[PDB]
Amino acid sequence: RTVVVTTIMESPYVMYKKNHEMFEGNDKYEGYCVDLASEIAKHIGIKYKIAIVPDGKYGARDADTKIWNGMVGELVYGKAEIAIAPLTITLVREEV
Amino acid sequence: VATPKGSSLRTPVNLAVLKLSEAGVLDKLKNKWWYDKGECG
Amino acid sequence: AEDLAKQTEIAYGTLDSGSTKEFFRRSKIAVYEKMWTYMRSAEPSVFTR
Numbered sequence: 001r002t003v004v005v006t007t008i009m010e011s012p013y014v015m016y017k018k019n020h021e022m023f024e025g026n027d028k029y030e031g032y033c034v035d036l037a038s039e040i041a042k043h044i045g046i047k048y049k050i051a052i053v054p055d056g057k058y059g060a061r062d063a064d065t066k067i068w069n070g071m072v073g074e075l076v077y078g079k080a081e082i083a084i085a086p087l088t089i090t091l092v093r094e095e096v
Numbered sequence: 097v098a099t100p101k102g103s104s105l106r107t108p109v110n111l112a113v114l115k116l117s118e119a120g121v122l123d124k125l126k127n128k129w130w131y132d133k134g135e136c137g
Numbered sequence: 138a139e140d141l142a143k144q145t146e147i148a149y150g151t152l153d154s155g156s157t158k159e160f161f162r163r164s165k166i167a168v169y170e171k172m173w174t175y176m177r178s179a180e181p182s183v184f185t186r
């Protein structure tokens with residue numbers, strides 16, 4: 001199975017290549033986290049697809065609705081298999 | 097690197113990060129994107 | 138070389154290929170890496186054919 005990776009467009013971690021209109025799939029993107037994802041996949045033995053989180057957020061729990069947004073939410077609610085991004089380890093995220 | 101509670105993927109993902117660190121690959125990637133591709137010398 | 142590394146009015150460079158260019162690119166010595174980043178970023182080019 002193809003592993004679904006959630007990430008976020010922020011330089012220099014993940015950036016769309018200048019010529020991305022001529023490219024397909026993962027090769028549309030470049031950056032530190034793109035290179036890291038490739039190294040992790042090679043060491044762990046999986047194929048993967050880079051997807052960009054829809055709401056453009058890292059991950060916080062709404063005070064009113066208690067719903068997690070961002071990349072954290074994509075993992076919590078079962079929509080993605082892994083997040084490879086500039087995502088800070090914090091107490092409230094480690095809890096979920 | 098984050099994942100889904102209890103996900104089996106998280107135990108090989110973590111070992112890979114520790115290995116890439118010890119091999120100097122994470123330092124190589126930071127240098128590539130910040131300094132080799134930097135514009136200010 | 139320390140004199141060169143501390144200034145920019147007098148430009149400086151290497152062959153555009155070969156062992157001399159590679160010495161500067163890979164050095165972990167502070168003075169030599171300072172010289173390398175200058176050469177890499179300079180416009181117009183400080184390298185020669």
Ligand SMILES: NS(=O)(=O)c1cccc2c1c([N+](=O)[O-])cc1[nH]c(=O)c(=O)[nH]c12
Nearest residue numbers: 010011057058059085086087088089090
């Ligand atoms: N300043 S920001 O862009 O608006 C920004 C806002 C909110 C969270 C950020 C963040 C940035 N950042 O600086 O790029 C990096 C980062 N890295 C993490 O690991 C994390 O958990 N959260 C963040």
